[PDB]
Amino acid sequence: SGPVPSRARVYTDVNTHRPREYWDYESHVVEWGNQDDYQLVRKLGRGKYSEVFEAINITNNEKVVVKILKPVKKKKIKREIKILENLRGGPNIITLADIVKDPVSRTPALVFEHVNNTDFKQLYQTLTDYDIRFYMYEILKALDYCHSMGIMHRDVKPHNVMIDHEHRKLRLIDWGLAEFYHPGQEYNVRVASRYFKGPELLVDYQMYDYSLDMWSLGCMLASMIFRKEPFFHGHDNYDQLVRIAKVLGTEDLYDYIDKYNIELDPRFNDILGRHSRKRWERFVHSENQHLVSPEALDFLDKLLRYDHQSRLTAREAMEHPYFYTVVKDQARM
């Protein structure tokens, strides 16, 4: 009789109380700059949707980062721009500095504040127990802010977390998949990386919310404290849910499907089978035990839930005992 509707438990109507211009990015007018102010130095990396370069602003001799966008729909460019401008100045949010366009090829490019070319994926293995809690707390600051601004990132993964370990700085980047949350709106489930897709994306439940980012955050935490990258290692979108079901169990999965009256793809009933909910001790060994604690396992369990409504919010996560020492040390400053 159709899926059961769902609402976010926090920041549900923040966009409703704002002017239309805040979230109606289709009508957003882009403030274009002059690309002659920037000279590219070297390429930093590629991607399906952009190429990233280190560049120099020749007007003030400032180092910047230039993201030349691949050809995508104009509304998607306006969405990333509007979200970056709404979140500008937020805690641990990357700063959009300028928007330029090649006068010949009409190719748009975003100019960001400079950050050291080193992300969370390259640094996790050398991090101590305290470093994991510290940087996870910094990620939660950025997530709680953008959620409070009515925006979900929808692509939380270590590759999108830039870290300057010398200064202990952290920046959340790549907002090309972020969207504004509106209660009752059905979103595209073809988002995020395979290993970080929430169960709602794999069962094709479109009325999701900020809680999607909290699942992806839980996938990062599990891979770091267990040193298993990725943690849920599926061969495809169907097998990705099977890998999750082999850990969280199938009974909670069918209760989740039953609660929201989700029409499960018939290709799943032959491959899901029957699996019990595993204990987190199964993934602990002598090489990751220094990163695993009862607080870490209790915090991880509250993030990786089938029911998106039962996962911790970003604000609830920041108050878990897992961060008690980090919060106390920041108060000492």
Ligand X SMILES: Brc1cc2[nH]nnc2nc1Br
Active site includes 164?
no
Give the nearer residue to ligand X in terms of CB position, either 162 or 224: 162
- Return all residues near 51 (Cβ < 8 A) that are at least 6 apart: 43, 45, 67, 68, 70
Q: How far is the CB of 176 from ligand X (least distance, A)?
A: 6
DSSP 160: G
Q: How far is the CB of 48 from ligand X (least distance, A)?
A: 11
48 annotated binding-site participant: yes
44 annotated binding-site participant: yes
The secondary structure element, H or E, covering residue 295 is helix 294-303
50 annotated binding-site participant: yes
Helices (H) and strands (E) in the chain, counts: 12, 9
DSSP strand pairing (151-152 vs 179-180) = antiparallel
Catalytic residue among 144, 155, 174, 209: 155
- Count of CA atoms in the C-beta half-sphere (13 A) of 121: 10
DSSP 191: -
CA angle 3–272–302, rounded 5-degree value: 70
Q: How far is the CB of 47 from ligand X (least distance, A)?
A: 7
49 annotated binding-site participant: yes
Residues interacting with ligand X, by CB under 6 A? 44, 52, 65, 67, 94, 112, 115, 162, 173-174
52 annotated binding-site participant: yes
* 3-state secondary structure at position 84: helix
Give the nearer residue to ligand X in terms of CB position, either 160 or 240: 160
Give the nearer residue to ligand X in terms of CB position, either 44 or 257: 44
Q: How far is the CB of 44 from ligand X (least distance, A)?
A: 6
Give the nearer residue to ligand X in terms of CB position, either 11 or 112: 112
User: Which residues are known to be catalytic?
Assistant: 155
- Name the binding residues for ATP: 44-52, 67
- Name the binding residues: 44-52, 67
